[PDB]
What does this fold into?
Amino acid sequence: PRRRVIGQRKILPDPKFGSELLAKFVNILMVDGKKSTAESIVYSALETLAQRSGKSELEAFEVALENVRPTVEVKSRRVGGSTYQVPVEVRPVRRNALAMRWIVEAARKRGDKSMALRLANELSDAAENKGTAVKKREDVHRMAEANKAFAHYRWL
Amino acid sequence: PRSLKKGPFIDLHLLKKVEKAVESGDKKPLRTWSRRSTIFPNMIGLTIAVHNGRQHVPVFVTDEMVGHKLGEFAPTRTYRGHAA
Amino acid sequence: NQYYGTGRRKSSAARVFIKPGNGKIVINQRSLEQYFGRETARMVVRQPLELVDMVEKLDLYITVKGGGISGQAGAIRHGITRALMEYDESLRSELRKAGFVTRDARQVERKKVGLRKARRRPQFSKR
Amino acid sequence: ARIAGINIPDHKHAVIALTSIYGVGKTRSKAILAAAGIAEDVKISELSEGQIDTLRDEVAKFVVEGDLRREISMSIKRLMDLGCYRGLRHRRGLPVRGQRTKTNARTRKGPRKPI
Amino acid sequence: QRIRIRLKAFDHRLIDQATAEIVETAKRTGAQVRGPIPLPTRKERFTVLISPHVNKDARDQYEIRTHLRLVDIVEPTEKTVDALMRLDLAAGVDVQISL
Amino acid sequence: AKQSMKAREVKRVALADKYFAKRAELKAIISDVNASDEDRWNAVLKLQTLPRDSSPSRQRNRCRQTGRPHGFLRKFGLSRIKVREAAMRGEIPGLKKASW
RNA sequence: GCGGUCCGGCCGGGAACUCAAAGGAGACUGCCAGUGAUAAACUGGAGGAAGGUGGGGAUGACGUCAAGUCAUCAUGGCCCUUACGACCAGGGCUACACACGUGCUACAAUGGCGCAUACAAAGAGAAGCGACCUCGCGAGAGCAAGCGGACCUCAUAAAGUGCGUCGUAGUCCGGAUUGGAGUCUGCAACUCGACUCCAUGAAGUCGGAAUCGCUAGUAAUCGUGGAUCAGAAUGCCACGGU
Ligand SMILES: [Mg+2]
Ligand SMILES: [Mg+2]
Ligand SMILES: [Mg+2]
Ligand SMILES: [Mg+2]
Ligand SMILES: [Mg+2]
Ligand SMILES: [Mg+2]
Ligand SMILES: [Mg+2]
It folds into this structure.
């Protein structure tokens, strides 16, 4: 980090559909070293959406991802002794990373019958863009609009 | 607790002195150091000067106390309180 | 008569044998669907059977010992891979590029004196 | 809805409802259900007065509610008036089975009283 | 009556020297033999605190390794058993002949 | 340690040697056996009657070369640090510093 | 694989393999390309099980802190030597208006509860590990096989998976605390041991300022073993699973 720069870590792709993003999503959903159950719920969530939306659930999760993927961030910094929330464009490897993380806790606060069911509803409601994910993304957009005043502060 | 197959516990010197005093009638307190012995009904209605470390505290044997130990009724610590 | 393979993911050993057949696999005198309860644990075994077309023509007797569920599955994967190596040795540009011949040397680290979890150091107060 | 016990157990399941009764835990609840002969896997029919009648005259063989409470008060107070060490801890609000009192005795002592 | 020789020694070099000096004595008396097998070497690890008064992170680990070898004799003879008794071997290896 | 402590310990092990085979084991078994009755009570009195130093639990194994009660090892019969220094001189066979 | 198969590596039988341990080979920026200052290096690639110190361990230079230890030990000086020495029984080191540090168990639904079902590694064991069978809800008791051990015994793992209920409730959570009755060690479990069964079910619904560990099989989490040990782990030292 301070001496030698290194790149990203490669993650074995999703076995059931060949994606890297599904594997990463389920990994970040994994808690306390339990990937066995995590795989079970992610398959159940995608098949509920498969029967609800079009048969190819690949595109449904994709659109539910793009409408919440963030392109601008908020970074706390101090240069001259004042708190600066500098907005910066984020590279796509971090764009999609932060988007799915927020979705993870968005489902937990949904509070449905089961964890699998709430993820399914969260991913579906994001497809129509009425989801709390879009709510959070509009929330970050207003503060991002607010941070355009900070955008020309020190360390632009 | 000592297992029921093994029975209760009692000390040889204590047992011999208790039966002599019982046979000769309850006359005087019984001086003892054996706190580990168990209160057995043969010494009912007697005063036992049980040791706590510095002074032998008298205890009277009553029916409801039987089974509990001889050294149980001798608090070895004196803590009035952390106040004045 | 029977092509041989060996596999070891973490602490397990796999004994993998190939014969021509109708695409049936037996694991420890037990079907794979019965043995590996986990769906991901199940299909990691058959992952190399897609890029290699020999899925429908190989009956595969396997005996795997030691390790745990994911470790035994990874060991199973590596053993089938090697067993194929002494058969065709002409699909390397595809199979290596997926990453199956590679033996996973990653391993559990020994505990250290003054550490709780072999790298975690006990939480301390500066004062 | 009231079982033979003074309290009124809920009507959500059978074992759970029994474990709502004072004086009977999960294991004792299983014992009483085995005595009555009632299981949840029977048909939905005949769920009526036909089982709690047996429940009333079976639970009477156990010591519950006031009888158990009266026994517990007598046990500690028998310990109390005896002048025993175990009763002395009971009197002073200190750990009675020999736990440490220097710290970590808060639940029997009560809340942390400041200086 | 097939006998079974068990040999224990701390040092791996010593057990090989021992198992290689027993065999040609067997050839000297002239009896066919079987190859020694390595039974799992046993490793014992003692972790001892090194500071005299007080430390906890300063502690050294000492291991004792005992290596165990098996020999099987197929057709013994009185001369062969006399050779086992008469032959001299290193003090670091013990004898556990079994009938 | 202390010569008084070492002298105490030698006396303790000698009495345990003297009494372990003569009464101790048989009194323990005749109290455990459920076939006998009230002969166990008589046995318990005589068991207490003994000098009471005969119990092997009355013994505390100590570093024989130094008498240190704490940090003892059974296999070597020495204190922790005494084992270390003797090992460095090479006096314990097959012993070295571990690495794994 | 061959046959036999009390259909279980159990029997002859095979040494090919897993494995055990003994020796040896290989990983050296070795070759290609790019950057660089045609150097060293760095980056990428090819092969390769492993690629850049392959991943960890041991190994801690000169020196600092009048750092710690005179209670491991030895030792200069100082003091006691009818007492600061020595033998005993009981007690204390476990006390509790409070504060701090280090940990274990939780507040739950990724969970609880019940049934069925699968695999580990490392070690211990002769005054010791203790099977099978019988009784006991149980910790355990009785009889007693074998094992100085790759054979015999602690020894079966747990989160996992499949089933059904719990359905968000201080709850089929949480387990303190307390009562009654017990088991085992030991001369003896009151002060003051651990564990089992029944009875009660406290705080706690994720925690302020602040503060700590951790860069890969690592955090996290789940069990297992050892030394100390008659008995007494949530500590310490090790092991494996996800
Ligand atoms: Mg681990
Ligand atoms: Mg001295
Ligand atoms: Mg002791
Ligand atoms: Mg100093
Ligand atoms: Mg000092
Ligand atoms: Mg202390
Ligand atoms: Mg122990």
About this structure: The longest helix of chain F spans residues 3-32. Strands of chain F lie at 72-73, 78-79, 95-97.
